[PDB]
Design a binder for this molecule. Structure first.
Ligand SMILES: [Zn+2]
Ligand SMILES: [Zn+2]
Ligand SMILES: [Zn+2]
Ligand SMILES: [Zn+2]
Ligand SMILES: [Zn+2]
Ligand SMILES: [Zn+2]
Ligand SMILES: [Zn+2]
Ligand SMILES: [Zn+2]
Ligand SMILES: [Zn+2]
Lengths: 118, 122
């Protein structure tokens, strides 16, 4: 239920933030640590987490491989979709559908963005 | 959020499945990859995925360090809670509370398990 979703999310966000702030103090944030931190931020209920999570994914975009960039663009569309930036979230998932046309998860996300605009 | 949570779950579950199957074909499966896959499995909508995630966590339990074992025990309690293995979920969350008495997440999880048992008539 909602209480269980809150418990697991708090456990993950508390661990990933502590791991992110520790590597940031050491001047060496790995891409996995920054991605998992932004992954929890874009799934948060509050906008100042979603905005922060989108910023972290934008920084990882010019530093990841083509397979890693697809996972970043997917959650950039998810993050902007939850910030009601529907037009920007569409160009992210459409550009993702150009390289993976048969991605059922990305194709279904386009439906949510389209139904939100309509 | 219902359709959106389904999308994020399948996207992560498919990504870590391929990374798990690739390392499995290589012979060696790292603890980080096996944990991340099991972490998504115990959070899936379907029960068969949750059971597979519990098995992967049971294999990592005797291997990991004391800090890694706390995360294994925490999600072993979450997985068994969703499968309504209540007494099994209690022994895990009570074991984590033995080493961390001030863990509000495990303390609230123990109350959640207790509520679900009374709602189910046990
Ligand atoms: Zn936070
Ligand atoms: Zn707020
Ligand atoms: Zn906040
Ligand atoms: Zn806030
Ligand atoms: Zn927050
Ligand atoms: Zn498959
Ligand atoms: Zn992860
Ligand atoms: Zn702990
Ligand atoms: Zn107790």
């Amino acid at each position: 239920e909602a209480v269980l979703n809150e418990l697991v999310s708090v456990e993950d966000l508390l661990k990933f933030e502590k791991k992110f702030q520790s590597e940031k103090a050491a001047g060496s944030v790995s891409k996995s640590t920054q991605f998992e931190y932004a992954w929890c931020l874009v799934r948060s209920k509050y906008n100042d987490d979603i905005r922060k999570g989108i910023v972290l994914l934008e920084e990882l975009l010019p530093k990841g491989s083509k397979e890693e960039q697809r996972d970043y663009v997917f959650y950039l569309a998810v993050g902007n979709y939850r910030l009601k930036e529907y037009e920007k979230a569409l160009k992210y998932v459409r550009g993702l559908l150009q390289t993976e046309p048969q991605n059922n998860q990305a194709k279904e996300l386009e439906r949510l963005i389209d139904k939100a605009m309509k």
